[PDB]
């Protein structure tokens, strides 16, 4: 199962810039033996949340040898025997041997590849180790939330340590970092806020309990068997005649929140796509090099 | 590996009806190479939440061939990452290319493959798109928690659902969470200045009804707020614990539908190629 992509007549030189991108992933649409370049392409500055949603409605595919005519590609998900394949690392900080890798859009300052003559641009998502992939998005949304409330400027928290070195985490809004990541920040902070307030509405006296015994006692009795006062959750007051301007059924908001939280959690990656298994090479690959990876 | 679920003698008026089951999945309990039909079996409909709790401790398998003597199968996921097989849609919704599939117990019941000869009947569970089974499970657990085309709840195991939900919700409350909560007014005033921000917040958001009723003072600085920072820890907890929230409630995705040559969508009641993940 290998697929090629039809390349239009770009130019001399630019074709070489493309051939120097020979290991990065691109997302096909339908597993058909003939797809065109115009198909596998996105606006190179866009909403990172929408890009993350698209990254699931598609099949991954890694670019094998490129030639002036076409460029082959191997899909990831479908397949048998887990055949290996070279994969070019494009993450900010490097990754070592034997750790799961995941795909995220260029969250930070973007790096689009732009074909001038074809009049089409391409997006190549970063490849991060699992833990740090879970961590970097939290880092950036924390920075956005800090600059949201006008508090202290920075305490030096825009650093991430990984394999000896420490990354600088470039300043925000350099190209469009403020704009491309805004909807994600909002959809996350609003959801956490919502979940917390719903919780607190469902059980009234949580925060006012013993900060060292009563709280702990509630948690340990909930985690254990179902005493739960019986119905520890107090019956909220009944709502209005359902046509008023101030009707508030807390349980419909609860179902809406469960739905939204699930649908968000889906579009966050945090599911390994491959697993580096380097052999006959340096045990660590720096950013911009090619490692032999085994698809999960 | 292939599971061999041996069958007793059945009615020729019903063996043939059971031959019409070629893409429906069944829930074993252990993975021995041989097994019996009397084993993989559930009673008629009832307690959808009990059922979905049952579909997590017992790994499933899809059947492939039905001969009058044996009935082969295939363990859905035990070591396979691309093991392509076929299974038929038996849900009310359709399914397009690419999207993952989930298994949810049969709704409303009345779908029971009755076998009067062996005196035993089955309930082949339905297959839904992911993002829609999410809504279904959310609705069911919300209505179950309400108890302090719809089946009546039980109040016996619904407390397990309420507990599993309220535990994960409670463990979201960190000393940094209130720092993020201290901007609800500052968030709302931003929501009304841009269209996208206003569209993000829903209508019955249950927080927009808080931003106009209650005031909160500046948040007190926590203990040793000069070395560490709680916002980032809070948000990492949030993402790590929300990336799997639906799983511990609903059912994990098991396969994604792929189609190489056929039409893009498969209508209900038709076999569809699939790759397991």
């Amino acid at each position: 199962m290998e697929v090629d992509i039809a390349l239009p007549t770009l130019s001399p030189g630019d074709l070489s810039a493309l051939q120097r991108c020979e290991g990065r992933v691109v997302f096909l649409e339908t597993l058909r033996r003939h797809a065109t370049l115009r198909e596998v392409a996105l606006p190179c500055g866009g909403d990172v949340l929408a890009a993350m949603a698209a990254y699931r409605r598609r099949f991954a595919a890694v670019i094998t040898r490129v030639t002036p005519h076409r460029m082959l590609a191997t899909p990831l998900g479908v397949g048998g025997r887990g055949q290996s394949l070279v994969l070019q690392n494009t993450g900010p900080f490097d990754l070592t041997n034997g750790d799961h890798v995941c795909l995220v859009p260029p969250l930070l300052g973007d790096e689009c590849l732009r074909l001038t003559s074809a009049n089409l641009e391409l997006r190549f998502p970063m490849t991060l180790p699992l833990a740090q992939a879970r961590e970097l998005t939290a880092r950036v949304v924390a920075r956005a939330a800090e600059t949201l409330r006008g508090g202290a400027p920075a305490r030096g928290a825009d650093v991430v340590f990984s394999n000896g070195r420490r990354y600088q985490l470039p300043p925000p809004h350099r190209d469009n970092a403020e704009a491309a990541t805004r909807s994600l920040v909002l959809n996350m902070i609003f959801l956490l806020n919502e979940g917390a307030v719903i919780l607190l509405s469902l059980i009234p006296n949580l925060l006012t309990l013993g900060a060292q015994d009563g709280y702990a006692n509630a948690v340990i009795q909930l985690g254990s068997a179902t005493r739960e006062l019986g119905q520890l959750v107090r019956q909220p007051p009944p709502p209005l005649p359902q046509d008023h301007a101030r009707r508030f059924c807390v349980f419909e908001a609860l179902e809406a929140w469960i739905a939204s939280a699930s649908r968000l959690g889906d579009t966050l990656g945090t599911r390994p796509v491959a697993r580096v298994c380097i052999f006959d090479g340096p045990p660590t690959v720096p950013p911009g090099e090619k490692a032999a990876v085994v698809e999960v | 590996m292939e599971v061999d679920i041996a069958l007793p003698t059945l009615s020729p008026g019903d063996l043939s009806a059971l031959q019409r089951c070629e893409g429906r999945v069944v829930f074993l309990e252990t993975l021995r190479r041989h097994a019996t039909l009397r084993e993989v079996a559930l009673p008629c409909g009832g307690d959808v939440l009990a059922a979905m709790a049952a579909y997590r401790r017992r790994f499933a398998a899809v059947i492939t061939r039905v001969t009058p003597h044996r009935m082969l199968a295939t363990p859905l996921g035990v070591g396979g990452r691309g093991q392509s097989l076929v299974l038929q849609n038996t849900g009310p919704f359709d399914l397009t290319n690419g999207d993952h599939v989930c298994l949810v117990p049969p709704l409303l019941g009345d779908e029971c493959l009755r076998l009067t000869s062996a005196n035993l009947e089955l309930r082949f569970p339905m297959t839904l798109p992911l993002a829609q089974a999410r809504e279904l499970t959310a609705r069911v657990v919300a209505r179950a928690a309400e108890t302090l085309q719809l089946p009546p709840p039980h109040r016996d195991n619904a407390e397990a659902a309420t507990r599993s939900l309220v535990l994960n919700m409670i463990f979201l409350l960190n000393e940094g969470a209130v720092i993020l909560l201290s901007l609800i007014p500052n968030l709302l005033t931003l929501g009304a200045q841009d269209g996208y921000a206003n569209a993000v917040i829903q209508l019955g958001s249950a927080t927009r009804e808080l931003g106009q009723l209650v005031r909160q003072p500046p948040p007190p600085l926590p203990q040793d707020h000069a070395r560490r920072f709680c916002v980032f820890e809070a948000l990492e907890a949030w993402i790590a614990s929300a990336s799997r929230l639906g799983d511990t409630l609903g059912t994990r995705p098991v396969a994604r539908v792929c189609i190489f040559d056929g039409p893009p969508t498969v209508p209900p009641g038709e076999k569809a190629a699939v790759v397991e993940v």
């Binding site: - | 590996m1 396979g80 093991q83």
Partner: peptide
């Protein structure tokens, strides 16, 4: 002095099709 033990390897990779389909 050039033909078929790497042209050996080459043709009859052939009698391997399962690489089974089962986990």
């Amino acid at each position: 002095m050039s033909v078929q033990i790497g042209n050996g390897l080459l043709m009859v990779v052939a009698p391997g099709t399962l690489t089974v389909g089962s986990a």
